[PDB]
């Protein structure tokens, strides 16, 4: 034993869905109201999950990005992925298929640890129903979690659930 177990997590999804707001809530317990588009940013946090001390390396990605050899190179470092859409943006939900295919391509595998995240659950303008998201997640064999980066609903659960999926795959 040389130190804690390390887990490399990557947050993906369409522009504006709340990838950065979810990550900053986890790290800083702060809600970011401004929309500052991301290119690529990295964060770290030590936490305890199921009685195991873990070091989380979190990579926050761009939601507006053409094909990039450089995008593939950082995505291939990930061990697990949060696939994020916004519950008031039907196009972001339809884009989940594209993110899943991109991940399978870069990892060259059919069985990659992933969690489906439906964010902005605090807003009144829901267009994607809970049952539709749950059916999509069941079709992939992965968990679904509803979140709000503003209220903090589900934020810790999303990241911890992804770590649990990585552990099941390793073992
Ligand atoms: N009401 C509410 N607003 C949110 C929520 N999560 C994010 N937002 C808002 O949505 C906007 C975009 O959030 P942001 O985290 O920057 O999205 P992103 O997915 O990182 N965008 P990009 O891909 O361009 O980096 C911000 O104005 C933010 O305050 C939420 O759960 N509820
Ligand atoms: Mg961002």
Author numbering: -2 to 168
What did the authors write?
The RAS family of oncogenic proteins is important as therapy targets because of the frequency of activating mutations in almost all major cancers. All family members function by signal transduction to the nucleus of cells via interaction with effectors (such as RAF, RALGDS, and PI3K) that catalyze phosphorylation of downstream proteins. When KRAS is bound to GDP, the protein is in the inactive state and becomes activated by nucleotide exchange from GDP to GTP.
Crystals soaked with PPIN-2 diffracted to 1.7 Å. It was noteworthy that both PPIN compounds have the same biphenyl anchoring group but different tail functional groups, suggesting that the biphenyl-type groups of PPIN-1 and -2 are key in targeting these compounds to the pocket I-binding site. Phosphorylation of AKT (downstream of RAS-PI3K signaling) or phosphorylation of ERK (downstream of RAS-RAF signaling) was determined following EGF stimulation. The previously characterized low-affinity Abd-2 compound does not affect DLD-1 viability over the range of concentrations nor does the PPIN-2 compound.
